[PDB]
Ligand binder design. Structure first.
Ligand SMILES: [As]
Ligand SMILES: [As]
Lengths: 124, 125
């Protein structure tokens, strides 16, 4: 049996490896460039507000009030970078958020003491 | 142990990112990521954090990075205007220190389907 609790952990030490290398810096820069576009971030808001369910371009055009060609231009940039997966079988193509790169970028930005939850697993 | 967990309930999945992403501050967030989409800037952030986040002078960072003082000074100015850094005096010498606030905010905007927490297992007898 396990009793689960979620509690507050004490703050971490500020910035709990060394400085990023030339290539690792070039890579994350490239990713931040992709999210550096207000349209792209707005796209992301709407994927997020739908619970990260898959969506079609016509659904995103309805959610955003921008044209299909606009939303497509930006979905390709986002898929190419790796923030979204394209599920192309069928009559209507879906796009799905991928969590992986968002987590890597969170790590890059772990500057300062963090306030985290702690999940205690009480096995008994 | 630190653990990135998947947030498989759609209501929980993006529960901390949805609001700031949806807000009229979203264009600001995107300007911040644009500021961050420069490699030299990211490395400056790296050198600062690799020093425990103490305030550092431009002279010290030009020595650490091998880049010229006009280069680093340009980057520092853009990062300070963005709010990532601010300036703190040491007598008449100007130091730069990272500000944790915006970064914590950016972490929340990027909490898309997963999050970091600490896992602790306990046994009982
Ligand atoms: As989500
Ligand atoms: As630090």
């Amino acid at each position: 049996t396990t009793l689960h609790t979620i509690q507050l952990a004490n703050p971490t030490e500020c910035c709990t490896t060394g400085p990023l290398s030339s290539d690792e810096s070039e890579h994350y820069a490239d990713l931040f460039k992709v999210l550096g576009d207000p349209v792209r971030l707005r796209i992301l808001s709407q994927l997020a507000a739908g619970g990260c369910g898959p969506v079609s371009v016509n659904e995103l055009t309805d959610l955003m009030g921008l044209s299909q060609p606009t939303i497509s231009h930006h979905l390709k940039k986002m898929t190419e970078a790796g923030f979204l997966d394209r599920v192309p079988e069928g009559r209507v193509v879906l796009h799905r958020v991928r969590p992986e790169l968002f987590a890597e970028l969170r790590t890059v930005l772990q500057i300062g003491s963090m306030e985290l939850l702690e999940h205690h697993h009480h096995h008994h």
